Design a binder for this molecule. Structure first.
Ligand SMILES: N#Cc1cc2c(Oc3ccccc3OCCn3ccc(=O)[nH]c3=O)cccn2c1
Lengths: 424, 544
């Protein structure tokens, strides 16, 4: 079938990125895998004349006992953006967040049969590193369309659209989105028949040559949740809560006034005047002080204005999406996705099982994956994260808990201030 | 030194061509002494004569070390050649080396000249030997093998070696061969008679490919001096470290001192560089003489006392566990040891905080554990068990209320002093029946004046005048006053998110003396609460 020509943006070179040191375990995985992968003609060994490199990590497939190779293709994506956005770019439907059930599938095993452009094969070069710098790593480049590259679904897009047609014909209430290796299927059906419809689609792709490893626990799951299933109808910007108290004290009112004054940046219609005068005299923090009529007026007013959506908040396709996660303790994490400050496109909170299962880094990682997934569902791309974690730590343990095929951009904040319970 | 080895295809940079640079210089005898070597290199087939038919050119000079050497100035080529895969940014660290019954060192001669060069490339590498005036046509040569100093020589030689060695280690995969540049290091568990057979076999294998090897046995006899190290058949250590004793110390000297100490800190435990690098904090002048401090002199003295006795480390044994233990040296400096058996250290190290003015002990411990984790993964490909001087209930309390998400692997308690503690905790909720100080502070940007004080609920007030301070420092000073003038239970209310954010982080030490004082005050108290209210909203605040 030959190849679609792939050119970088004029004035840009191929990716040169250092390779992270890896556990001997992960190295054995990336050796075995790449060995059989070489035997299947998917990849080949290169020479010293190929300066390019891209990172490679070893993860778990989903819950599986067998390993999985995860390439970080980011820097290549930044330099190929003309190919998979401008020219061959895949459109994102804005109505996927509208449906009540969205099931995600892994179609990434399709690209492995499609040949990659010969002149572009040198850019996909990756290195399997060794221990204690015994030798430089084992070099490989991609002969086929690589998983994780944004150009792969862009090329495969035609074939994909051809395969999904007999399915889209039978039920044109269903909207399907393709983001890289993932197929997001939206529906309005009942859960019971939704899962079955999904199985119809799965066997449809399965009989046309796309073998998706979404084969689940077969018949009887021991203890686990079958599908990966979201519900975007419950995804919206969450309101701010002013803690309800029978009797108010001085310090409670101080925290209240402070919080409201913070809320005055997103809501110009906030007045603390009637709450500022009640604290006028300098009293003890623990002294119990009842509210007045003016104060209650000012409370009931700002309780009403707080549950209204912010006026004039619109998504800008030119600007990047930016996410912030802050740690609330007790396995709960709060997050906001904004483009410009104080304009919050999406807000929410993520929590986990209570018991000894999960720890900090695990919770954070899973949180990142969740927020990213929601962002993909809504605006059609991944937000850049500001992460509340030490850089070298996250750079170490993030792969352990990462089950996703993609890797969103991130950076690490050492500050974050009094904003803790303000978002709680 | 001829080779039948497959060659790496090479291109120049895009939209670029071969170097053309003219060389006149210099002596009659340099010209004369170049020809003699050139003839031998031609006879050996390393180079070949050409008339133009354009060779381009490269500048060529001759140098003397009895035996002359040919030098080519290739700077105008390397800039024009394609980039290559980087080779080895670093060297294998002895701490992670498998211990073998015998180790043999073999260096190949004329390394780069023992591998061929791409045919459609060689034309760019050509040069001239100037005739002695008289406008006489030059002697044009070109390289048929990897030139010295060329941009691709190390990578290509290393690659060709990598491929050449492949149908050997297949025949005998009981022998371990470490590849480093021009050097090949072999080791094994075989019989001392069988080992010497395998080495001799490999030498012939390489010989059939055109690679020279030392004839007298195989060269260097242990111990080996390698990259500043000393490799004994049992133990390893660094090379002799000489710390100079001088009256005058420049920045150039301090850089060498810090270098040598940092280097020697991988095996010799307890080495402290914090105070000595504080002198290097002036980053500006290179040749300026820097006066030592009283702390730095003592630090160097301690380092000397450690550098009196020799001490050395052991090698790696996968069949045994990996253990790491950490000790605190108190100035923000930490030292750590990584061992298999208690009296045998693989290697040691040190970690000290630089970035940030405020940090506690638990966090620094976490960062130390972190560096040790990274280093461990790099060297041994795994992570160590941790022996740390901290109680579980201390740490568990720390990471639960800490805003960042940190992590530590499996670790067991160690009671060896000093232990890491939480010296104080700010109360989560305000204290009922405790005096409430409303503190504030202010300063003038120009005059650097301004004051710090408080007004309590009991009507008590105070103001202290302050010269030569900053707006923030007074905001800390007020909270200090509130701690001095209060009882054992005090509720403080401040408008400054600066001071609040600082104190809330619960530091046990800092650079600023004021903060040290505040910590001192916080330890003595029974219960401490610190709240926050918006400034200039006219609520309970101070106006001065
Ligand atoms: N000149 C020098 C030199 C030798 C080596 C080196 O030798 C080894 C080769 C294979 C396996 C284990 C080895 O050494 C393990 C350590 N060791 C080193 C010397 C010795 O006698 N015994 C011993 O177990 C590896 C890396 C750098 N080198 C630099």
């Amino acid at each position: 079938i030959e190849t679609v020509p792939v050119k970088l943006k004029p004035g840009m070179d191929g990716p040169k990125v250092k390779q992270w040191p890896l556990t001997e375990e992960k190295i054995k995985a990336l050796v075995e895998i790449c060995t059989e992968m070489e035997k299947e003609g998917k990849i080949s060994k290169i020479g010293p004349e190929n300066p390019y490199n891209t990172p490679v990590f070893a993860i778990k497939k989903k819950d599986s006992t067998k390993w999985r190779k995860l390439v970080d293709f980011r820097e290549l994506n930044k330099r190929t953006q003309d190919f998979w956005e401008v020219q061959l770019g895949i459109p994102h439907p804005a109505g996927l967040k509208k449906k009540k059930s969205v099931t995600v599938l892994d179609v990434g095993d399709a690209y492995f049969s499609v040949p990659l452009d010969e002149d572009f094969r040198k850019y996909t070069a990756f290195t399997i590193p060794s221990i204690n710098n015994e030798t430089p790593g084992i070099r490989y480049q991609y002969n086929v369309l690589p998983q994780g590259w944004k150009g792969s679904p862009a090329i495969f897009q035609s074939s994909m659209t051809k395969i999904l047609e007999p399915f889209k014909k039978q039920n044109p209430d269903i909207v399907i989105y393709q983001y890289m290796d993932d197929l997001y299927v939206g529906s309005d059906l009942e859960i019971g028949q939704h899962r079955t419809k999904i199985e119809e689609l799965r066997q449809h792709l399965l009989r046309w040559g796309l073998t998706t490893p979404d084969k689940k626990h077969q018949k009887e799951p021991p203890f686990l949740w079958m599908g990966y299933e979201l519900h975007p109808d419950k995804w919206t910007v969450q309101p701010i809560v002013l803690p309800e108290k029978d009797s108010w004290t001085v310090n409670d009112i101080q925290k209240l006034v402070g919080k409201l004054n913070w809320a005055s940046q997103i809501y110009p219609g906030i007045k603390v005047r009637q709450l500022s005068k009640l604290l006028r005299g300098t009293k003890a923090l623990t002294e119990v002080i009842p509210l007045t009529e003016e104060a209650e007026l000012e409370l009931a007013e700002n309780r009403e204005i707080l549950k209204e959506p912010v006026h004039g908040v619109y998504y800008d396709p030119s600007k990047d999406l930016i996410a912030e996660i802050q740690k609330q303790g007790q396995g709960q994490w709060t997050y906001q996705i904004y483009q410009e400050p104080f304009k919050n496109l999406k807000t929410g909170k993520y929590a986990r099982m209570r018991g000894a299962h999960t720890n900090d880094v695990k919770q954070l990682t899973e949180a990142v994956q969740k927020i990213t997934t929601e962002s993909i569902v809504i605006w059609g791309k991944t937000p850049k994260f500001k992460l509340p974690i030490q850089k070298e730590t996250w750079e170490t343990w993030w792969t352990e808990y990462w089950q996703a095929t993609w890797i969103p951009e991130w950076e690490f904040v050492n500050t974050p201030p009094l904003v803790k319970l303000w978002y709680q | 030194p001829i080779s039948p080895i497959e060659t790496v295809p090479v291109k120049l940079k895009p939209g670029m061509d071969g170097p053309k640079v003219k060389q006149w210089p210099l002596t009659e005898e340099k010209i004369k002494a170049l020809v003699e070597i050139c003839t031998e290199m031609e006879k050996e087939g390393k180079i070949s004569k050409i008339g133009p038919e354009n060779p381009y050119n490269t500048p060529v000079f001759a140098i003397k070390k009895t035996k002359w050497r040919k030098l080519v100035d290739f700077r105008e080529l390397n800039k024009r050649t394609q980039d290559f895969w980087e080779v080895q940014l670093g060297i294998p660290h002895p701490a992670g080396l498998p211990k073998k019954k015998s180790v043999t060192v073999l260096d190949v001669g004329d390394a780069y000249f023992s591998v061929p060069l791409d045919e459609d490339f060689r034309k760019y590498t050509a040069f001239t030997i100037p005739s002695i005036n008289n406008e006489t046509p030059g002697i044009r040569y070109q390289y048929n093998v990897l030139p010295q100093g060329w941009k691709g020589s190390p990578a290509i030689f290393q690659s060709s070696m990598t491929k050449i060695l492949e149908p050997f280690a297949a025949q005998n995969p009981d022998i371990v061969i470490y590849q480093y540049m021009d050097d090949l290091y072999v080791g094994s568990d075989l019989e001392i008679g069988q080992h010497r057979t395998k080495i001799e076999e490999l030498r012939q294998h390489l010989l059939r490919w055109g690679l020279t090897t030392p004839d007298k046995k195989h060269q260097k006899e242990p111990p080996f001096l390698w990259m500043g190290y000393e490799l004994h058949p049992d133990k390893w250590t660094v090379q002799p470290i000489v710390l100079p004793e001088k009256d005058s110390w420049t920045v150039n000297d301090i850089q060498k001192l810090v270098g040598k100490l940092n280097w020697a800190s991988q095996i010799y435990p307890g080495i402290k560089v914090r105070q000595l690098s504080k002198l290097l904090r002036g980053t500006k002048a290179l040749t300026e003489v820097i006066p030592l401090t009283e702390e730095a002199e003592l630090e160097l003295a301690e380092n000397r006392e450690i550098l009196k006795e020799p001490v050395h480390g052991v090698y790696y044994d996968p069949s045994k566990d990996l253990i790491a233990e950490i000790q605190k040296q108190g100035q923000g400096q930490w030292t750590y040891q990584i061992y298999q058996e208690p009296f045998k250290n693989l290697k040691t190290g040190k970690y000290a905080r630089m970035r940030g003015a405020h940090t506690n002990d638990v966090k620094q411990l976490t960062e130390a554990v972190q560096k040790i984790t990274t280093e461990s993964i790099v060297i041994w490909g795994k992570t160590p068990k941790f022996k740390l001087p901290i109680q579980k209930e201390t740490w568990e309390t720390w990471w639960t209320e800490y805003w960042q998400a940190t992590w530590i692997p499996e670790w067991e308690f160690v009671n060896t002093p000093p232990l890491v503690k939480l010296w104080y905790q700010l109360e989560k909720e305000p204290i009922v029946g405790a005096e409430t100080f409303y503190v504030d502070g202010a300063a003038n940007r120009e005059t650097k004046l301004g004051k710090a004080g408080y007004v309590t609920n009991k009507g008590r007030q105070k103001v202290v005048p302050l010269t030569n301070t900053t707006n923030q420092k007074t905001e800390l000073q007020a909270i200090y006053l509130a701690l001095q003038d209060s009882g054992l239970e005090v509720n403080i209310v401040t408008d400054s998110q600066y001071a609040l954010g600082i104190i809330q982080a619960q530091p046990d030490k800092s650079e600023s003396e004021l903060v040290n004082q505040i910590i001192e005050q916080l330890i003595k108290k029974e219960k401490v609460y610190l709240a926050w209210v918006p400034a200039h909203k006219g609520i309970g605040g101070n106006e001065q």
